Amino acid sequence: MVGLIWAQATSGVIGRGGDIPWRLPEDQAHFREITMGHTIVMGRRTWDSLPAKVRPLPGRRNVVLSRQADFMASGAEVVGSLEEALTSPETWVIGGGQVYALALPYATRCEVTEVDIGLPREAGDALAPVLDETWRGETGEWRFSRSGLRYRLYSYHRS
Ligand SMILES: NC(=O)C1=CN([C@@H]2O[C@H](COP(=O)(O)OP(=O)(O)OC[C@H]3O[C@@H](n4cnc5c(N)ncnc54)[C@H](OP(=O)(O)O)[C@@H]3O)[C@@H](O)[C@H]2O)C=CC1
Numbered sequence: 001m002v003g004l005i006w007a008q009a010t011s012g013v014i015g016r017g018g019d020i021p022w023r024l025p026e027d028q029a030h031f032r033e034i035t036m037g038h039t040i041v042m043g044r045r046t047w048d049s050l051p052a053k054v055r056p057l058p059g060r061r062n063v064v065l066s067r068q069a070d071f072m073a074s075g076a077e078v079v080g081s082l083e084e085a086l087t088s089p090e091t092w093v094i095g096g097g098q099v100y101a102l103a104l105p106y107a108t109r110c111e112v113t114e115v116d117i118g119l120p121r122e123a124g125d126a127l128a129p130v131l132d133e134t135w136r137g138e139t140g141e142w143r144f145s146r147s148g149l150r151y152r153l154y155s156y157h158r159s
């Protein structure tokens, strides 16, 4: 089982400036619940975006994708292809835009959080992959976060 998990603004923006341009505490708990105990796969830039105290993410098999054959990430496995990182019972690809687009052809689930902020897409932004006709999803209802922002969960799956 290869899943993808991300939070996006409605526009599809997931990253900007090596950061996520919002903070949604509920989503962080949701991400932790979904990924805990499993293999997580991330691009090197997303690994870099994790503060030193959060890397590696506890209780998960942290795997980092990099074209750098020398690259070493303290607390994660560094591999040079996605298939190298996809050795699993359950793997969650956790970002960023590049690695999501690389991983979607091998994914059966996407756990999407949509953040209701009018964040327009800007050149250089990391974007969410757009899910086509093969993706069947169920919409969650709007929720309000402690952060003040409105958000809702999507659970996408394909057979
Ligand atoms: N839910 C969210 O909203 C999330 C948002 N983000 C955001 O995403 C943004 C970064 O995403 P992005 O900019 O796309 O960078 P990525 O995080 O996708 O990592 C990109 C790196 O992955 C490695 N890589 C990519 N393709 C391959 C390949 N085919 N083979 C081997 N290694 C590969 C390279 O590392 P090298 O260059 O070292 O070879 C590349 O630089 C940040 O702003 C981050 O905060 C991240 C995760 C979740």
Ligand SMILES: Cn1nc(-c2ccco2)cc1C(=O)O
Pocket (backbone or CB within 6 Å): 019, 020, 023, 031, 049, 050, 051, 094, 095
């Ligand atoms: C920037 N940033 N990225 C993440 C993240 C966790 C999993 C994927 O991305 C958390 C944070 C944070 O709260 O600082």
Ligand SMILES: [Co+2]
Pocket (backbone or CB within 6 Å): 033, 034, 035, 036, 037, 038
């Ligand atoms: Co689980």
Ligand SMILES: [Co+2]
Pocket (backbone or CB within 6 Å): 108, 157, 158, 159
């Ligand atoms: Co299935």
